[PDB]
Design goal:
Layout: H1 4-16, H2 21-25, H3 31-50, H4 56-69, H5 86-89, H6 91-99, H7 103-122, H8 131-156, H9 161-165, H10 167-184, H11 186-191, H12 199-202, H13 218-233, H14 236-244, H15 249-269, H16 285-293, H17 297-312, H18 322-333
Helix pairs in contact: 1-3, 1-6, 3-6, 3-7, 3-8, 4-7, 7-8, 8-10, 10-13, 10-14, 10-15, 13-18, 15-16, 15-17, 17-18
The structure holds ligand PS7 and magnesium ion.
Amino acid sequence: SLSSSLKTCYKYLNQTSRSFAAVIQALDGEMRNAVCIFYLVLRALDTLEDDMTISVEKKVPLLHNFHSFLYQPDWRFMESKEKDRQVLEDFPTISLEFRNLAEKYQTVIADICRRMGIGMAEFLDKHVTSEQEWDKYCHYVAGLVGIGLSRLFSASEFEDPLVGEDTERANSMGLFLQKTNIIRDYLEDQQGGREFWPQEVWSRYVKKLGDFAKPENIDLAVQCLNELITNALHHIPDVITYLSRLRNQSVFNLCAIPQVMAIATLAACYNNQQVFKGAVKIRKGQAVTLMMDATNMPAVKAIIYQYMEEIYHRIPDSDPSSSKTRQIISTIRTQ
Ligand SMILES: CC(C)=CCC/C(C)=C/CC/C(C)=C/[C@@H]1[C@@H](COP(=O)(O)OP(=O)(O)O)[C@]1(C)CC/C=C(\C)CCC=C(C)C
Ligand SMILES: [Mg+2]
């Protein structure tokens, strides 16, 4: 029943997505293929953005015109050294199945691809300075994914136009997972020469971001860690609002599960010295387990509050963000 090229696409999905493979495949009807392809295209775009062997000069055009390659049946890329390179090397298969989608899905995917590429290109020439610039970077690489996902949910008509139209809530959905991964991946990123923590934040603690890796700076490092976590917690009211509107079970599970996995990650990272020594880059099993039964808003809220409580009771009174952290948590609780 499934074509060869589509089986391959779902193959690539399972190979490359630790976080989304199962939920994508459980999607109802015409959403499944559309979101699968959306994933694969963005994975290909990211595989380009992240490859450091590709010079800025060559990368810029690639990121700018990546959206147009979807409509070039022959287009592939063979120069990648990245682990996920096969999506670029077999891009024609992916772009084939992309062109097999209804126009309404293609237009969304292409638009998000164009916008993301322009954004990723813009950050090749700069660091993340301010918190606003942090939000801007996250918007380009993650915010727009939630915005695109939401426009696909609306286009399909399983969800109301509001889901696709409330771009702020969809953006926050994207921002929360991306801040979470950035916070969690400090060391891995430092060791690979990538820096994502906003300078205006860490510069109040140390002179170079890599200094958080020095044992003598652990206490300052954890302070900065708690400040950034606290900034990310601010997206949770919006996540609640967004998850509260979803009508379709499959869509609700797709959106809810990664948000809750991220919340468990943050709680595991709060005031945790070990962030600076490596990574819990494996889903929290307590969270996976709780989410098996959490198919509705009141169950998801209960899990959120529980994790928020876990952070709340561990806040040091001496930590300089201690007030803000308690404050956002209290807001979440009453949303
Ligand atoms: C289309 C689809 C699901 C995904 C496409 C994702 C791709 C490839 C984007 C290209 C840039 C990248 C890479 C961004 C980072 C993803 C890493 O997750 P992760 O856990 O590391 O995966 P795994 O661990 O399995 O390797 C990220 C954090 C953004 C996820 C933002 C979402 C999902 C919007 C939520 C909003 C609503 C639900 C409104
Ligand atoms: Mg990237």
